Amino acid sequence: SLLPVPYTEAASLSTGSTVTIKGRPLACFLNEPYLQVDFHTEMKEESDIVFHFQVCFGRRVVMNSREYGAWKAQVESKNMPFQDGQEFELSISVLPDKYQVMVNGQSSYTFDHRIKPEAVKMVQVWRDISLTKFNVSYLKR
Amino acid sequence: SLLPVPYTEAASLSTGSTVTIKGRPLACFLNEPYLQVDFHTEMKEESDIVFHFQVCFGRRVVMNSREYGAWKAQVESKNMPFQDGQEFELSISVLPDKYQVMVNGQSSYTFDHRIKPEAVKMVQVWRDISLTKFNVSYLKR
């Protein structure tokens, strides 16, 4: 749809920042489309990832970090608030101790900070979705 | 690039048919982009899949069929002829007993027929690639 996918935006994050994403899977859940959101330390796609969020729609979510080129301890969730065939609204809030992921207004995942959110320089949203909205808030000191 | 992804084309297959695909991953291999090619029994995306071919670039390939809505026995390969950052040419030939997958001219995977190739009505190419060429040959009786 509207925004290009893969979608890359330079970004800064700190406590109080919110990343808002509205989009839709490109396939029915039987075909297992993916969604991935990565908070990177540089604009380069091969850079480290402070927060990796990967949905296999209808199946599972994995979260991780990639530090000095290497994936760390994977967190796997079977929580699946996403609905087959539907648009979703994803909010990722930067709290003092963790990221909180809201899906369609419902708290759905959290991930404790392994690297300070101030290390983030770029956000990438990609895999099997269309994207109609992407925002990073910048209202707090 | 040129062709829309996900890419869907109505198709018929029999012994001697070749499916030719030229494209490029949308991400470096460190980020594990995927490629998927599915030979479907109907135009509907939720229809059965006579041949499912899914590459996790740099990691593995899985092949399967989806019959009456259910995935069957997975075949997993660690053969990885695809090159990081490069365009690829994929050929899938319909032989009497199997599909043969050539990558950049090199025989790389085969998959014995579980359902007659004449059941195919549609081919879908999707996930994290751009596509510049897609062809199904129709020269044989």
Side-chain angles (χ1 to χ4, degrees), chain A residues 1-23 25-43 46-58 60-77 79-88 90-96 98-132 134-141, chain B residues 1-23 25-43 46-58 60-77 79-88 90-96 98-132 134-141:
Chain A
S1 83
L2 262 286
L3 294 171
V5 177
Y7 182 87
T8 302
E9 187 172 307
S12 298
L13 298 178
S14 55
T15 301
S17 300
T18 298
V19 184
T20 304
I21 300 161
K22 183 145 53 176
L26 294 176
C28 67
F29 281 17
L30 189 66
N31 288 358
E32 295 182 14
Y34 287 89
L35 161 67
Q36 186 159 320
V37 179
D38 296 310
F39 294 174
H40 281 265
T41 61
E42 305 289 345
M43 292 296 299
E46 70 272 15
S47 68
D48 286 354
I49 296 168
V50 173
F51 179 51
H52 162 76
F53 176 82
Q54 189 198 71
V55 182
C56 181
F57 287 102
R60 71 176 188 161
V61 172
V62 297
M63 288 167 284
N64 209 339
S65 55
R66 186 168 74 200
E67 306 180 24
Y68 309 95
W71 296 106
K72 304 305 290 188
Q74 174 171 101
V75 177
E76 180 182 74
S77 171
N79 194 27
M80 188 53 55
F82 301 94
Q83 297 302 301
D84 194 2
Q86 305 310 309
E87 182 178 74
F88 56 83
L90 196 65
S91 201
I92 304 169
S93 295
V94 182
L95 305 181
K98 72 197 85 168
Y99 299 102
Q100 174 164 228
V101 182
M102 318 286 289
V103 179
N104 301 324
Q106 172 190 358
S107 181
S108 298
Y109 317 91
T110 72
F111 184 89
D112 285 356
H113 296 306
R114 302 172 177 185
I115 298 165
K116 55 180 183 181
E118 289 82 3
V120 171
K121 292 188 191 52
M122 178 268 271
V123 177
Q124 188 170 69
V125 182
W126 63 299
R127 305 218 190 252
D128 310 297
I129 66 155
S130 58
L131 210 54
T132 59
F134 180 94
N135 178 262
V136 177
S137 69
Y138 290 97
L139 301 184
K140 311 295 265 167
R141 169 173 262 296
Chain B
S1 83
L2 262 286
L3 294 171
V5 177
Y7 182 87
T8 302
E9 187 172 307
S12 298
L13 298 178
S14 55
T15 301
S17 300
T18 298
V19 184
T20 304
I21 300 161
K22 183 145 53 176
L26 294 176
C28 67
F29 281 17
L30 189 66
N31 288 358
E32 295 182 14
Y34 287 89
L35 161 67
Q36 186 159 320
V37 179
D38 296 310
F39 294 174
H40 281 265
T41 61
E42 305 289 345
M43 292 296 299
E46 70 272 15
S47 68
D48 286 354
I49 296 168
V50 173
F51 179 51
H52 162 76
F53 176 82
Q54 189 198 71
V55 182
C56 181
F57 287 102
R60 71 176 188 161
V61 172
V62 297
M63 288 167 284
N64 209 339
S65 55
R66 186 168 74 200
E67 306 180 24
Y68 309 95
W71 296 106
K72 304 305 290 188
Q74 174 171 101
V75 177
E76 180 182 74
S77 171
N79 194 27
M80 188 53 55
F82 301 94
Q83 297 302 301
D84 194 2
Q86 305 310 309
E87 182 178 74
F88 56 83
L90 196 65
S91 201
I92 304 169
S93 295
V94 182
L95 305 181
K98 72 197 85 168
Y99 299 102
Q100 174 164 228
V101 182
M102 318 286 289
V103 179
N104 301 324
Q106 172 190 358
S107 181
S108 298
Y109 317 91
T110 72
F111 184 89
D112 285 356
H113 296 306
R114 302 172 177 185
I115 298 165
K116 56 180 183 181
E118 289 82 3
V120 171
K121 292 188 191 52
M122 178 268 271
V123 177
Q124 188 170 69
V125 182
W126 63 299
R127 305 218 190 252
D128 310 297
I129 66 155
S130 57
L131 210 54
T132 59
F134 180 94
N135 178 262
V136 177
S137 69
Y138 290 97
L139 301 184
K140 311 295 265 167
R141 169 173 262 296

